[PDB]
Amino acid sequence: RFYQMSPEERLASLLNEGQISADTKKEFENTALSSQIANHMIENQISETEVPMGVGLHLTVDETDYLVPMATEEPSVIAALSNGAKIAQGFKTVNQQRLMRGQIVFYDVADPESLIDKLQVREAEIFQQAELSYPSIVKRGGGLRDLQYRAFDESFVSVDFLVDVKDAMGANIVNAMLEGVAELFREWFAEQKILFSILSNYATESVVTMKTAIPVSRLSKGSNGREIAEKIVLASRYASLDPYRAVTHNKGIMNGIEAVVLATGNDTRAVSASCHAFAVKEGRYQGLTSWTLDGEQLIGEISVPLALATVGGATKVLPKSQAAADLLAVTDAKELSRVVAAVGLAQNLAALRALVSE
Amino acid sequence: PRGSHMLLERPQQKKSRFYQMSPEERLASLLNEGQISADTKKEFENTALSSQIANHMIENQISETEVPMGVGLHLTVDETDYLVPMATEEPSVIAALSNGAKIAQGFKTVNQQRLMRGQIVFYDVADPESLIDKLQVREAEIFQQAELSYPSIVKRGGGLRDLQYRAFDESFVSVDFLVDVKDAMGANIVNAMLEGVAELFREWFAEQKILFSILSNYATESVVTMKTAIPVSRLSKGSNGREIAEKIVLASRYASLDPYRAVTHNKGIMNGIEAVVLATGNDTRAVSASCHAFAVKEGRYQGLTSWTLDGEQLIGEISVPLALATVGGATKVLPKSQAAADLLAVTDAKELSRVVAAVGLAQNLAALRALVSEGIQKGHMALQARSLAMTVGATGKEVEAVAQQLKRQKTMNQDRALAILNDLR
Ligand SMILES: CC(C)(COP(=O)([O-])OP(=O)([O-])OC[C@H]1O[C@@H](n2cnc3c(N)ncnc32)[C@H](O)[C@@H]1OP(=O)([O-])[O-])[C@@H](O)C(=O)NCCC(=O)NCCSC(=O)C[C@@](C)(O)CC(=O)[O-]
Ligand SMILES: NC(=O)c1ccc[n+]([C@@H]2O[C@H](COP(=O)([O-])OP(=O)(O)OC[C@H]3O[C@@H](n4cnc5c(N)ncnc54)[C@H](OP(=O)(O)O)[C@@H]3O)[C@@H](O)[C@H]2O)c1
Ligand SMILES: NC(=O)c1ccc[n+]([C@@H]2O[C@H](COP(=O)([O-])OP(=O)(O)OC[C@H]3O[C@@H](n4cnc5c(N)ncnc54)[C@H](OP(=O)(O)O)[C@@H]3O)[C@@H](O)[C@H]2O)c1
Ligand SMILES: [Ca+2]
Ligand SMILES: [Ca+2]
Ligand SMILES: [Ca+2]
């Protein structure tokens, strides 16, 4: 019955059964998100978590000014972003891509190559079925983009689906498309077995690279601008050597990125999973940014998979997500990813500069 | 050309900088400079967290993000029943956690440690092996200064516990500090302790140079491992319980071969873990950072859980570093954190980490069972049909009736769910 009760009835049941105090109940009742919206978004809803939201300052991306909504519970995070962006002055997009990835995994595959060669010769029909399983995205101008195949040891075979989901995160688009094609596969190969069909959150085809060039004089109010830069460069390289520093290094970056992702109603677990997994380069967890000295300029670069969204999920139904989107005022998801990647690099600059200046 | 940033438009210099203004003044300035609409300003003004609390926690505060919070059910850890506060915006996460916990019935602790790491890193070290030995013999005084740099923790029963040393590139040296921060996360306890020990490191060695002294979020000494044992019959409403178990084992095994699946595998785990971390006012970045880095094993990003078959039993196990906290940070200054803490009803941070790890394993179970059984979509659409019913006003047993009819529709809507509801009345 608990999952069938109203929020008001669930709180009363919790109090009646001694599971929460009376003051705890009154606090759970002090909400600002409409009960209608919250109760229909999740299950067993009783209340809300309120995260303070502030405005990150001085971010410029490709000669466009931005005001960054940042939801965070940690002090100094928004100030660090603002000081880091002010010092950097601007950020420039080195390259951007935006495709989502999914997979259908066969198991107990007798001869992998046989199965794979079978699929490659019928790719036209697969694209046909993928359109039928979600035709709306194809009308918007997206849809399936490529098919890839990977044969693994232990008799696994993965069919990789790369999709253009436009401004959505794409989970429900990709999952629907994959389950529809899975049916066709089971019709084509009654012999074979399908372990699962699901989207991959490792969005290596949604990577964004930002960069910044900083006159070393801006790194200090005084004369030791180059000294601070040389130590920033040293700190960044040590992240490539000590995972115990790289994790803190990337955590500092995600303080800014996850604040914007949260404020705009995007999925924080998805972005945190892809970014940290993308940090694994050459079998070692390293930093997501590089800092080098080219003459009298400190040059920083960031590369992160940012399959973010401006539509779908919680980006619209939560009024605060719409308000944060009004403040940021990005026109599409690709732009959101560029702004978020710049926030990451700005956060990292403020963190390293403070780390080596003390 | 290169004009300045549009923020220097927000200052009221005829009087005040943005970071000095009050939240109300900061919103008025935002509206007057064309950055937000009137409706957006009013929505920002609709807040439940005290303005005095929010404004003094962060900088340039203007409003708040509201994440719905629900209650996960059926979780049992070490023969104790729990009600898990879960803060999330994703549908089905809480229902899946309840389903996964119900299927497993309970979780037990295999091992647990709780120590926060810190590091003081030397750079430009000529002979690393020399400086190291020069430090190992003076550990008696290193432990003493650590106590005076932050004595409060030592009288509460904690403080520095161990010192280890590593060298990289034959030019870097790192002094590793293992600290017991009790129920706090330990960031400010460690940092202050390390910056104080760095001082005498300079006094001792005017020859060497320190690059930085700071905590490490990679809390490999806060790993907690949870276990579960499920009769295969509980994995299906039908008769193929074992078949399902066999598929879950392979899905878990496949995660260990394809990082593209492992990331999604751990993402599902973190849907539950981060939802409790957020509800209790803990630092979500620190947990996801240490958890995903811990996922890297033998030079390969893999799944954080293992699933194996032992006779008629499906055996699941999770291992993650959870340096969570029950005090400090945002665990108390945020009233909702205290309310969520009253519901979870844990006594210490060690118990918090144990419950959160179990939540992760239960979450993993629900996802994997659905993926290898009917698929992830069927469950989602069903919850979506019920949500669309309550939106239009479905009550009582009309919730399932309207959801049943929405299933028949090729495309479910709020426009059509209202039509179904009115006919029933
Ligand atoms: C969604 C269910 C639970 C449907 O549930 P069902 O299969 O129809 O079975 P049921 O309705 O008879 O009851 C299932 C139990 O789940 C709970 N439950 C059931 N319905 C509700 C509800 N309305 N409100 C609250 N709780 C609910 C409830 O505890 C219930 O038992 P009971 O308490 O009644 O004895 C099932 O399909 C399921 O578990 N799906 C898993 C979906 C999931 O894991 N979602 C997480 C977000 S998606 C994700 O993780 C991404 C992913 C999957 O890609 C990660 C990965 O790949 O690993
Ligand atoms: N593996 C995973 O991690 C996983 C698994 C399951 C669920 N999820 C969750 O599923 C959600 C993300 O998936 P989703 O975005 O596809 O949900 P969605 O809300 O159903 O899809 C996007 C919505 O935005 C609309 N839209 C408007 N303009 C669009 C545009 N330019 N491009 C694309 N769509 C546009 C779409 O309309 P049309 O239908 O007409 O196209 C659609 O209704 C998140 O809540 C996520 O956390 C994640
Ligand atoms: N790299 C990073 O992640 C990083 C860096 C810097 C800061 N931070 C932030 O710093 C905060 C976490 O650090 P913190 O935990 O040390 O915050 P904290 O609030 O300063 O420390 C814990 C507080 O709880 C009190 N307390 C009561 N009972 C305790 C117990 N059993 N054990 C420990 N403390 C107890 C302590 O009293 P006493 O004062 O007497 O000791 C202290 O005031 C977070 O806001 C975090 O995001 C993170
Ligand atoms: Ca191809
Ligand atoms: Ca605007
Ligand atoms: Ca030792």
Side-chain angles (χ1 to χ4, degrees):
Chain A
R1 173 121 154 109
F2 192 85
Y3 89 99
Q4 311 180 8
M5 290 163 136
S6 68
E8 187 227 299
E9 282 175 355
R10 291 194 267 256
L11 284 172
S13 159
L14 290 170
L15 174 83
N16 160 48
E17 297 280 341
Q19 279 145 347
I20 56 161
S21 82
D23 288 349
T24 286
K25 171 163 185 292
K26 185 175 231 162
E27 178 64 52
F28 276 152
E29 284 150 20
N30 168 44
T31 54
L33 174 67
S34 152
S35 186
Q36 251 259 335
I37 294 167
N39 192 29
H40 309 341
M41 282 178 72
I42 55 153
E43 303 84 40
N44 299 342
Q45 192 259 326
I46 52 158
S47 186
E48 71 190 24
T49 289
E50 291 113 27
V51 180
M53 191 201 288
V55 186
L57 296 204
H58 302 291
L59 198 80
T60 301
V61 181
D62 297 321
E63 297 193 333
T64 295
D65 291 348
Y66 290 97
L67 303 183
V68 185
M70 303 177 70
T72 197
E73 87 291 334
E74 185 179 355
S76 100
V77 164
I78 298 178
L81 180 283
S82 294
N83 184 46
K86 187 168 182 146
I87 290 170
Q89 306 201 265
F91 300 80
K92 293 179 179 179
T93 305
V94 179
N95 48 65
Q96 170 162 50
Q97 183 176 31
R98 186 184 170 74
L99 297 168
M100 284 308 283
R101 175 183 280 256
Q103 62 190 153
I104 292 170
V105 177
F106 298 79
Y107 70 106
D108 290 357
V109 187
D111 175 71
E113 259 292 294
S114 179
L115 172 54
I116 292 168
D117 305 41
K118 313 243 202 84
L119 299 153
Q120 296 181 308
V121 309
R122 312 145 154 110
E123 273 194 19
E125 279 163 282
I126 295 164
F127 275 87
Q128 208 176 29
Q129 181 69 23
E131 167 164 351
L132 293 150
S133 313
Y134 213 87
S136 73
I137 191 62
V138 173
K139 274 174 217 93
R140 297 193 113 93
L144 183 57
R145 178 70 66 74
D146 194 23
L147 292 159
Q148 326 205 346
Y149 312 86
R150 289 180 297 151
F152 294 77
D153 274 14
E154 322 220 349
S155 303
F156 292 107
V157 172
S158 180
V159 183
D160 306 305
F161 290 71
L162 287 78
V163 186
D164 171 14
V165 301
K166 289 294 181 223
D167 293 310
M169 189 261 148
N172 306 340
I173 296 172
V174 171
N175 287 340
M177 165 181 324
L178 295 177
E179 292 194 6
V181 169
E183 294 178 58
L184 191 35
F185 288 178
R186 291 187 306 263
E187 206 187 314
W188 284 349
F189 323 98
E191 52 261 43
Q192 295 294 353
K193 301 188 258 277
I194 288 175
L195 191 66
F196 64 73
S197 315
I198 197 60
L199 169 129
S200 173
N201 284 113
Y202 196 26
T204 51
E205 286 74 39
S206 273
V207 174
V208 170
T209 305
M210 302 299 306
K211 75 166 198 252
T212 194
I214 310 180
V216 297
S217 74
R218 306 184 56 82
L219 289 170
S220 207
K221 75 191 159 58
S223 317
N224 63 332
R226 199 161 203 297
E227 253 68 40
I228 286 166
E230 280 164 11
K231 268 140 199 249
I232 285 166
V233 167
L234 274 186
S236 171
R237 182 172 83 102
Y238 182 68
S240 148
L241 306 171
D242 189 354
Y244 288 91
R245 173 63 209 161
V247 173
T248 315
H249 182 102
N250 293 332
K251 196 271 190 191
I253 288 160
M254 302 306 297
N255 275 337
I257 291 191
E258 173 164 15
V260 186
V261 172
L262 176 64
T264 55
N266 272 278
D267 184 352
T268 60
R269 286 83 57 207
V271 46
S272 191
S274 53
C275 291
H276 281 291
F278 196 78
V280 187
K281 274 167 206 73
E282 304 158 323
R284 173 162 72 270
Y285 185 98
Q286 312 186 48
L288 289 160
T289 63
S290 66
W291 289 93
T292 71
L293 254 171
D294 170 52
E296 275 313 271
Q297 279 168 320
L298 175 63
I299 296 199
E301 178 164 293
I302 190 166
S303 266
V304 282
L306 292 184
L308 299 188
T310 56
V311 302
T315 57
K316 296 286 181 174
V317 299
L318 292 183
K320 293 296 190 300
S321 302
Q322 291 210 237
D326 171 12
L327 177 64
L328 190 59
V330 290
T331 59
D332 65 63
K334 271 185 182 181
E335 192 183 341
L336 176 59
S337 294
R338 297 192 296 272
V339 171
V340 164
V343 167
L345 189 66
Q347 206 73 57
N348 191 226
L349 173 58
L352 301 180
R353 186 209 146 270
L355 193 79
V356 303
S357 286
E358 301 165 354
Chain B
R2 299 193 142 66
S4 296
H5 196 293
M6 71 200 169
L7 285 166
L8 304 172
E9 263 46 54
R10 279 105 117 294
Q12 304 282 52
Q13 320 202 44
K14 279 305 159 303
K15 311 306 303 297
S16 206
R17 258 195 106 200
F18 198 68
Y19 83 103
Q20 280 142 26
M21 322 186 139
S22 65
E24 316 94 272
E25 284 159 1
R26 278 193 276 261
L27 282 168
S29 181
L30 285 171
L31 175 87
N32 269 357
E33 305 313 324
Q35 297 306 317
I36 60 178
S37 82
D39 286 1
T40 287
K41 181 167 168 287
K42 182 127 208 93
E43 182 59 49
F44 276 142
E45 281 165 351
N46 173 42
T47 55
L49 174 63
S50 155
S51 183
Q52 222 201 303
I53 299 182
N55 192 28
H56 292 110
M57 218 170 337
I58 56 157
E59 305 79 53
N60 303 335
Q61 192 264 331
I62 46 154
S63 186
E64 75 195 18
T65 291
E66 290 119 11
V67 179
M69 186 201 307
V71 184
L73 303 178
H74 303 292
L75 188 79
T76 297
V77 186
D78 296 309
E79 321 309 313
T80 306
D81 293 339
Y82 291 95
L83 302 173
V84 186
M86 296 181 80
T88 187
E89 86 296 336
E90 191 179 344
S92 82
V93 159
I94 295 177
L97 178 279
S98 313
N99 194 29
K102 207 194 113 159
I103 292 164
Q105 309 199 264
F107 303 80
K108 69 189 262 193
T109 309
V110 185
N111 58 68
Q112 181 180 24
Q113 194 179 349
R114 181 176 176 81
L115 287 178
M116 268 305 305
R117 270 251 189 141
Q119 51 168 195
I120 303 189
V121 170
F122 293 93
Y123 80 97
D124 231 320
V125 161
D127 198 325
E129 299 300 326
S130 296
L131 173 51
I132 293 154
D133 277 85
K134 262 153 103 147
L135 270 153
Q136 308 182 120
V137 297
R138 327 211 33 200
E139 278 190 23
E141 312 165 68
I142 301 169
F143 276 64
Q144 222 306 291
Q145 175 76 60
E147 161 151 3
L148 199 87
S149 302
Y150 207 95
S152 311
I153 186 49
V154 175
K155 44 182 91 137
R156 270 201 317 291
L160 196 276
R161 292 281 180 268
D162 194 14
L163 286 166
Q164 302 163 30
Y165 311 81
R166 292 174 300 149
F168 291 94
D169 193 14
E170 299 180 308
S171 60
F172 284 104
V173 176
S174 168
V175 187
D176 309 326
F177 297 65
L178 273 42
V179 184
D180 178 0
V181 291
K182 291 294 166 214
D183 289 314
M185 201 247 266
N188 310 307
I189 288 164
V190 172
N191 289 335
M193 155 177 321
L194 278 294
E195 304 218 320
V197 164
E199 265 179 328
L200 286 191
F201 273 15
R202 309 203 169 74
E203 310 294 359
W204 293 5
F205 305 62
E207 42 149 3
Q208 300 297 250
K209 285 165 270 172
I210 289 164
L211 185 48
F212 59 80
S213 45
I214 197 73
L215 70 105
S216 170
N217 286 89
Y218 196 26
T220 56
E221 282 79 40
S222 295
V223 175
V224 55
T225 303
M226 307 307 275
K227 190 183 190 103
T228 189
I230 316 182
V232 295
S233 70
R234 295 186 68 71
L235 295 164
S236 179
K237 300 229 196 109
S239 51
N240 61 336
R242 180 182 252 293
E243 171 188 312
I244 303 310
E246 287 168 7
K247 294 191 74 194
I248 286 167
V249 172
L250 292 169
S252 158
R253 173 61 190 169
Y254 180 79
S256 100
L257 310 175
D258 186 3
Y260 280 102
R261 169 57 199 159
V263 174
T264 323
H265 176 120
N266 294 325
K267 198 277 199 196
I269 288 160
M270 299 306 298
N271 279 331
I273 287 182
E274 180 186 290
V276 194
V277 171
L278 177 67
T280 57
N282 267 287
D283 186 315
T284 60
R285 284 81 64 211
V287 181
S288 34
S290 65
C291 269
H292 283 295
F294 196 74
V296 180
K297 299 186 182 68
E298 32 170 292
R300 264 137 36 70
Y301 183 97
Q302 291 179 56
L304 285 164
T305 59
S306 71
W307 288 94
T308 70
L309 264 163
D310 192 18
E312 277 175 333
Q313 306 245 301
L314 175 66
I315 311 292
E317 198 181 280
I318 191 173
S319 210
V320 282
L322 297 166
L324 307 165
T326 40
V327 306
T331 59
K332 277 279 208 316
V333 294
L334 290 173
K336 290 295 194 298
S337 303
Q338 296 205 41
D342 188 24
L343 176 57
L344 188 55
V346 287
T347 61
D348 56 286
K350 256 159 143 183
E351 185 187 353
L352 176 59
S353 293
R354 281 193 304 273
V355 174
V356 174
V359 160
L361 193 51
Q363 201 80 50
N364 195 226
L365 178 66
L368 295 180
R369 190 212 59 73
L371 278 183
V372 305
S373 298
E374 71 280 10
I376 202 74
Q377 289 298 92
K378 188 172 171 69
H380 273 54
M381 296 192 273
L383 294 169
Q384 186 174 134
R386 303 178 76 269
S387 150
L388 277 165
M390 310 176 140
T391 296
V392 296
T395 313
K397 277 278 188 178
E398 311 176 334
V399 170
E400 287 307 311
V402 186
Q404 190 80 237
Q405 266 298 120
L406 284 164
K407 176 190 66 162
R408 282 125 164 89
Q409 322 300 184
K410 294 180 180 179
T411 285
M412 314 175 296
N413 271 84
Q414 175 191 282
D415 295 336
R416 179 161 272 180
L418 176 57
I420 298 161
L421 171 59
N422 270 343
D423 285 337
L424 207 69
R425 297 170 164 174

